[PDB]
Assembly symmetry: C6
Homo-oligomer: 224 residues x 6
């Protein structure tokens, strides 16, 4: 019914029954340090390395140089992909309206013939601009235009509780076709990472929380 794109992130394409729905956005929400940026980098990296699908990474608060430096933790050379024209890192770092940003993103997608897009994290621009009032409207604008473009998008968001609202403004999951929750639960002085696919409109997926670890090779999910 709906076609999916392989993420090649260990375990994820099993949990999602094939990968992420093509041409749609997937919200990846989680508290700080849960692995959201990593998930969004792996998504682009694997598309390039495994499938020669170019990617655009939109960063708000982290600098492109820090994204590149941090990815060396995993032995991934993103500078080389940028040099080869296969990755573009769009720096979106400092009435509220995402129209201008959407034009920039669209330019990059057409220029680099990108099939994958990662946006990390649009929560920060809403919050820095004090734009909670229009989050539902502007996220809708962004999600809708990315769909018109045909991009397959990972969109990260913040949340402040492990078991609580999906995201910070309490509306983000409802305008998203697809929702993944990363958790980092503290119990008995120990942390455990888990991943959940809450929803994929129009298709099936495994349910509940699945454990994962972050290693030198990135995210490893165990699809019990």
């Amino acid at each position: 019914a709906i076609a999916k794109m392989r993420t090649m992130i260990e375990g994820f394409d099993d949990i999602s029954h094939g990968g992420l729905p093509i041409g749609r956005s997937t919200l990846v929400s989680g508290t700080s340090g849960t692995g959201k940026t990593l998930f969004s980098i792996q998504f682009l990296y694997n598309g390039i390395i495994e499938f020669d699908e170019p990617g655009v990474f939109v960063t708000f608060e982290e600098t492109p140089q820090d994204i590149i430096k941090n990815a060396r933790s995993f032995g991934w050379d993103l500078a080389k992909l940028v040099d080869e024209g296969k990755l573009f890192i769009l720096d979106a770092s400092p009435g509220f309206d995402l129209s201008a940003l959407i034009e920039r993103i669209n330019y990059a997608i057409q220029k680099y013939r990108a099939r994958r897009v990662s946006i990390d994290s649009v929560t920060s621009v809403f919050q820095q601009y004090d734009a909670s009032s229009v989050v539902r409207r502007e996220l809708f604008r962004l999600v809708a235009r990315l769909k018109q473009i045909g991009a397959t998008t990972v969109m990260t968001t913040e949340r402040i509780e492990e078991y609580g609202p999906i995201a910070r403004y309490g509306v983000e999951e409802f305008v998203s076709d697809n929702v993944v929750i990363l958790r980092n639960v503290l119990e008995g002085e120990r942390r455990r990472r888990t991943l959940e696919i809450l929803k994929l409109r129009g298709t099936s997926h495994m349910k509940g929380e699945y454990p994962f670890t972050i290693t030198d090779h990135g995210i490893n999910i165990f699809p019990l």
Copy 2:
């Protein structure tokens, strides 16, 4: 003359729980957190009305495009495109362009009249204003004579019925879809909280979503 009559949904298990289906000529609120099956329920209500009883339906969408409603319904082997082309289903696009309630209600009445519709699904910041506006909608749908499913959002599995804390009190009928997380596993359940002027089963009934749509099971099952 007699107590209220019901219209069969044909959603497996639901007509048992509702003691006959949804109260005719009224609206039923179906509330749930994200991914609980709300849009599915409202689609299945229309689809079954068309296939089983040749009762035309109007689907009102506020954020999903008609194309995506049609695409997603193929997950269950339902061909909504065929139904739209036969004039049995009309998808009213009220989604924004990548709010006027009176204008909306007029469009809905227009569609109900044009397509002879007997079923309607509507899917989906002061609580005082929400109460007044939802009341107007419910009341005018009842004047038109529609049997309606209207979905609403909620945030917590075992908190308020719906986002604003008022929606269930202006509704005649309320169904709650939950997606309960316990010990890392999810369990879907459906509950008929209330049907004014008629009987229904009580409590949460477990259900699944499969290639066949929603299938509801007996109490404490699964």
Copy 3:
């Protein structure tokens, strides 16, 4: 010397209240949605009429008279007949799709016109709510009405009613609950308070059936 009470004839209730509702006073009936508030308030009037020939005035704020009448047919009650016979008056204060003191005067006009002994009223700042609810309860008391007034609440074991004041201005308070535990619902009724008189304490389970509300003994089911 006690407070005089009028029988509700609602199965079990007149035992729990030790004689029924205090006459000439208002009783708050609070509950989450679908707990039986409107039913309790209709059954109070209906029984008043059928058992005692005591006329009743039903004040509706959101449901229409025709829907009230239709819904009561669930219980085999013919409210339309009672309106035709002048025994029941349904005052429609529900808004048209498409002022407190004024409403009170229409209520009093109805009470005097129909010589009603029973009144049911069904159903954003706590200060204003407290002041206006006090004026309504006080005016009904001066009129001599015995009143059931319903209110909303949003949690089964939280505040008595939405604004956190409603129970303090009421002489009498009844709480209807619909408790969800282990995927099952259990309806319970509690008389929290009756000023000046006695009543059973705590929660009593009840059912709603074809014959209305039926309240059961302690710790039952």
Copy 4:
């Protein structure tokens, strides 16, 4: 160290080690239907019957006629005490300033030579007048002037949780010399009434919750 006045309410003078501190105010707080008005009526009634100490009852929302009628539940004839000049029921029923009310109360105390005063409930006037802003200030005014007068006062207040703040505005206990909490706890579908003396400045008292019942004879506390 500080002299106390017997309440003669069954069990209470044991819990308070002698009764209420003379010349001071005692806050009696509780959720609705916990017995606050009853406690405040018994305090005056017993002063009159047992000790020929006249009393003034200040009522805000309940009418004097209802106070009198309700007290017949217990076989107490308050109309007769009013007729004999031993009880005065002051009807205080409908910038915020209790000065005028305080003058009325003072007039009644002097006129009737009252030793006991019950005020039930000043919470309602604060709330009806939307005067949360000045609760601490105005309660202080009232408590201080009653102390200057020499009255021994029971002052009831509302609260909305059994285990939670002492009173509605979160300040009332701090301007009171003495604090009593009435609770009506629901557990396992059963209610239990308890009374606690939280604090009596400058003197001793029993601690914790003590069970009580309300009967035809009024409040019965069991001072375990």
Copy 5:
């Protein structure tokens, strides 16, 4: 030259828990719900300073009148009237008449100078403003060289340290008095949360209030 020195309170048990008493020349916040023993603690601090060490004290009261402070202290057999008449204790009446902080601080400094006081007790709506103003007071008391107990209110036994959520962060030293209700019984406990630049015992220590004042006991006692 060396780490901070302490002044003995002589409150039974307290100087053990504080590893020597209260840090000299600083303020110690003593926070508690109503009836926890805050005023008692602050009175005992001065009284013991006078009786045991001939160190004069100033008591600043904001709501209890001096007459009532004196009256209530007779519960413990303490004759504060005698101490005021000997010029060893001064009760500064800052209570309202049945707010100017700079003016208050000047009066406190005046009293400290007039009576040669070495100990001070102060007893007792935007959190930002409270933070700034409390900071000014603490800082100016430290400039004067007072060793001070300052009491504050709190609402919950195991919630915020104090009413506004900022008071402990501008204090050098924090003591929490609790009155914990469990199974219908109350248990009083005292905790030294923090003393900057010095050591102290940790956790809650049970205490009683009796005719002798506050008596603190070893851990897990009673």
Copy 6:
């Protein structure tokens, strides 16, 4: 290729962080009152100076330099000597009893003057807080400083910091807890996150003694 780290020499910490704090970045250290935040931040500079001759700048917002110095004598540290020798600079931003970008320029002036490699910063609308904290972290990064910045929180197992944003703009996050259970306190340290590198997970108990912070093994005591 890893992220380079600088050793804190705080007992146990450099093991938990797998080498120390990421160089040229800021580390958030959040905690309720009296959890050891100022101590952690002083020990970071002190060890930098004593172990590695790396000068440090301490920015204080409420405690005075003289109190910082007095309090450190608890640990047998002579900070006054280090200020005299030009190895430690305490920037006083505390208010006098009786503008972000400006503060940043005074910090940078201090860093350049004293050739500091280490910086500690100690310590009402979430939007504004997020924007200003981002500007500070970004400017410190451009300057090249390795920074410890303390923040407050009010619950041991609640939000990381007061405004619910502080941890998201930080590259590195450490949480100090002081957990009260059964009338006993237990101090724990947690490294929540270090962008781009590895670290041990969960809570590690620690003590504060005459020698500063000592962090213990897993599940200890």
